[model samples]
Target: DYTAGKEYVELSSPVPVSQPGKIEVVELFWYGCPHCYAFEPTIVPWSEKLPADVHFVRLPALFGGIWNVHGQMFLTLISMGVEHDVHNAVFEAIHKEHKKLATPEEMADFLAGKGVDKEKFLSTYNSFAIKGQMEKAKKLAMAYQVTGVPTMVVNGKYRFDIGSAGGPEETLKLADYLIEKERAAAK
Candidate 1:
C-alpha cells in the first residue's frame, strides 16, 4: 500500500518517534500560513479518525518573522490548555477577520477575547515553559527539514505535502498507508 516514489519520500536520515510502539505523524504547520489554514478543515476530521496506533502531533514551524511569533502563540495556547478551543479560531481570525496579531499584546488581547482570562493567559503565554516548547518545536522542524507549512512526517521516516500528494485528502491517505506499513513492520 505504501509506494515511496508515488506518494511520499523516505528520509535518508530518519528521525525517531517519541513513543516507542506507536507510529508518530507530525504535522509541520505555521499558524499564519494560508495553506495551513486551508488544510485545517480536512485535517481536523482526518486526525480524529486516526487509529489508536497512530499518534498525531502538530508542530508550528519557526522560520523566523511572523512564523516565530505565531509559533510562540501556538505554544502558549497549548500551554494554557486552550488550544483545542482556540486553534481553528486563530486561523479564522487571521484569514477571515484580518486581525494582525503582530505583537504579544495583540495576542494577549485576542486570546483574552476568546474566553481565556487575560491575566492568566498572558502569564503562561510569556512563561519559561512555553518558551521551551517553542524552542523544541523549532528544533523538531529543523530535524524534519521542513521547507513549508502543512507538511506531514510519518513515523519520522516519510515526509510529504499536499502538493506532493496532489491534495490534502491524498496526503492523509499516504499517512494512513505509512501507518499501516509501520504497523505491519512492528508485527
Candidate 2:
C-alpha cells in the first residue's frame, strides 16, 4: 500500500484513550494550518458517522509558537463544553473571514459577538481546567510524535496523514479500514 509504512506507522508505545471497550480515533490538527482547515469538511462528516463503539477526538496541535495560542482557544472551547458549537465557526473565522483570533482580546470579542458571555468566555479561556486540557493536548501531540497538522491516529496505535493517505478523501477511507481492523481484533 502507498501508506503502509511511508505514511502511517505502528506506534512502539501506543497512547491510551477512553475505556478499554471502545476504540479511539484522534485527529491532531492546528487551527492556523490551512491544510487542517481544508480537511475540516471531509473529517467532520466522517466523525459524525462513526459507530458508537468508536471515540473520535480532535486535538489541536501545540507544537510551540503560534500553535499554542490557537491550541488554547481549542482547549477553552472544549472546557466550556462549547467546542461542538464553535469548532467549525472558529475555522471559518480564521480561514474564510480572516479573523486574527490569536489574542485574548480578539478571541473574547469575537466569541462575545457569537453570543458567548464576555465574562464567562474570558474566565474559562484562562481557567485552570482549560489550562490542564491545553497541557494534556500538548502531551498527546508529543506522545503521538505529531510532525504536522491533520494527522489521524486510529485506536492509538496506527496513524496516517493526508499526504500519506493520498488525499483528504483517502484519509477517511483509511480511517474506516483501521476502525474495522481494530473492531475485528477486539472481537
Candidate 3:
C-alpha cells in the first residue's frame, strides 16, 4: 500500500495549479541528473497517455551550479518553442554522447548543430524573460519543498519521488492514485 508520509507526502499548504479546471501533475527534473534520465522512459510514455483532465508539465530544478545552468537552457528552449523538438536530443547529448553542455556557449554550439539559430539561442538564453522563468521555477521548487530532482507533485497537493515510491513505475502508480484521489475530491 502506498501510504501518505511513506510513499508520498501530502502538502500542508497546497500549491495552486496553473490551470483551473485541470488536475496538474508537475515533474520536477534536471537534465544532468542520472536518476531523472533513467526515469524518462517511464514518464514520457505515461505522460503521453494521460487523461485529458490531467495536465502534465516538466519544471527544471534550478538548485545552483550546473543545475541552474541546465535549467536556464531548458527554459530558453521552452521560450524558443523548440523544447519538444530537441528535448530528447538534449538528454542524449548529455547522457549517451557525454557532451559537456555546462555553459551557454557550449549549449549554443550544440543546439546550433541541431539546427537551432545560435544567435537567437544566445539572445534568448540571456533574456530577461528567461531570467524571470528561472526565478519563477526557483520559487515553485521552494513552494514544493523540492530538494532533489525527479520529484513529482500531483495536483499540487501530494509530492513523491522514485525513491520514496519504490521505483519509476511505482512512482507513477502512486501518482495515479493521487490523481484519482483528486478527481474524486473534485466531484
Give the winner by lDDT: 3
The sequence of per-residue lDDT tens digits that candidate 2 reaches over residues 142-168 is 888888888999888897898888899
Which stretches in model 2 have alpha-carbon errors above 4 Å? 1-3
For model 2, the local distance difference test gives 0.85
State the lDDT of candidate 3 residue by residue for 31-137, as single tens digits: 98999988899999999999999999999999999999999999999999999889999999999998979999999999998889999999999999998999999
Stretches of candidate 1 off by over 4 Å are none
TM per model?
Answer: 0.93, 0.94, 0.96
**Model 2 lDDT, residue 48, Cα:** 95
Which stretches in model 3 have alpha-carbon errors above 4 Å?
A: none
Better of 1 and 3 by TM-score: 3
Clashes of 2: 0
